[PDB]
Symmetry: D2
Subunit: 115 residues, 4 copies
């Protein structure tokens, strides 16, 4: 499990559950090719997006549909989605956890890259 | 204006208006002595708390009452307040802007220090 | 000044100066058309990007090149850039301040929207 | 395990390891009584601070010594420590995770309160 995503809700103080997201990998034509997708679990986590063999060096984009999440709660959000764009590099550690902390008008994202 | 505090509301995407705060300074006996206090304006800023002459080297605490802010908006939040504790003017006089970004279960605080 | 962007450096506690960014607007064909661009000033702010007449209803993307910022400081950061994507002026004209707080492995973005 | 603390380093994109913290509970005299303490593990987490029987309703303060952490890395921090002050309430969910995301000039803290 080289890539995991964890999403938290700063309004309710809870995991953000059932949040959809799509991952894309940049191709040579400089367009985003679909790579992986899913919805967060009851822990706010999405596991199993890819495998070590499939996740090679490259530029990846994680698009988290935050707008649908807030609309389901009845709170008017600012952003269309939260996007996280990064290069995977083999000199660095093996595992990438992308964390996102969501508020209606604000979000933060942090990468925890470990061995 | 050597010390300014700016407070923002991450739920509404707005300045946080009428937020009370109290500033304290550590005394020689290691107690917190009252220093200055005020409330944020319609811009979410609190200016005029002190002067260059009065704000001497020391350890200062800014206590922002976030709980009353959220309760007035109908929200029961997690934190009693947001505390910011720092040494000031150790190297000579500086201008300090303390920023706080508020959500019911989360907050962030950042210092911008200029010379 | 209907759109302003403010960028801060959480490592140094300073405005993030000379940070490039490009703004795009979604076209009728669902592509991102160039809208405006610039670099932050010594205050970490970028003003004058557009006018009330030019900034019409639409979906906008602000792409802040954080990677070049960190590399110039000797830091190899996680993200390629920080993207902020939002619908603007849906309810009529508003003033938008997009704030970004930068660390090498983490960033936050907040919108302050006033009328 | 009703109370856990998780600390992340936003500069290095890693758990914040060996971070000391002290927890206090407010007494009737309105002073902070020592309650629990420890250092974060290699995962950046501190478990086992208290038990369900001992953690009763009350006002608690978690003081995280962020200054010593940055000083060990050779980066000049702004804050003396990061403080998280909150009321434990039995009407809410059982488990409290206090998360802290650290930068030298900025930190955020979030409570995830779950069942």
């Amino acid at each position: 499990c080289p890539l995991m995503v964890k999403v938290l809700d700063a309004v309710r103080g809870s995991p953000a559950i059932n949040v959809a997201m799509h991952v894309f990998r940049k191709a040579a034509d400089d367009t985003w090719e679909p790579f992986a997708s899913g919805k967060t679990s009851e822990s706010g986590e999405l596991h199993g997006l890819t495998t070590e063999e499939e996740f090679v060096e490259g530029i990846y984009k994680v698009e988290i549909d935050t707008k649908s999440y807030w609309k389901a709660l009845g709170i008017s959000p600012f952003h269309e989605h939260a996007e996280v764009v990064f290069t995977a590099n083999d000199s660095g550690p093996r595992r990438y956890t992308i964390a996102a902390l969501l508020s209606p008008y604000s979000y933060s994202t942090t990468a925890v890259v470990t061995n």
